[PDB]
Design a binder for this molecule. Sequence first.
Ligand SMILES: [Ca+2]
Ligand SMILES: [Ca+2]
Ligand SMILES: [Ca+2]
Ligand SMILES: [Ca+2]
Lengths: 144, 24
Amino acid sequence: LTEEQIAEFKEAFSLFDKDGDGTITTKELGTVMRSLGQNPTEAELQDMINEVDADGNGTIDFPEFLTMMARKMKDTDSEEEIREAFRVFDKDGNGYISAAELRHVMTNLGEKLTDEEVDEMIREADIDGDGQVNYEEFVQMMTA
Amino acid sequence: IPRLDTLILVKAMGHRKRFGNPFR
Ligand SMILES: [Ca+2]
Ligand SMILES: [Ca+2]
Ligand SMILES: [Ca+2]
Ligand SMILES: [Ca+2]
């Protein structure tokens, strides 16, 4: 356990915990989801909370959030997990991640990337130099 | 729809400024 790790988890939690009251509500989740282009129903949002809500009180607190992370660090490799991740980027769903989409997704998730950083991130994964990242290239970067 | 942990996974990648599992 390091200080830099805690800080990272703290800011991830803060992104969702809008009013900083120490809990993430279905309403707060909805806000972040909508800004990312997604449009879940109330039932879907509550479902998202319930799977991480260990004490079943209706909201997610820091310990539950941290536990979720620990469990996610165990397995990020399925297909459905990778596909799920790729789908977040591919906003329009045409099969490729463009620099514009990467920048938009990262900004709304609180990560400030420089134009140059965006391009380099894309370039490292762009196996066919077409300037985008398709599922295959995405999977190859994840599965290794 | 994506899971909450998938969102944190993506944020971490952005944080590392690189694609690929940002943890392991
Ligand atoms: Ca809150
Ligand atoms: Ca709870
Ligand atoms: Ca696209
Ligand atoms: Ca490509």
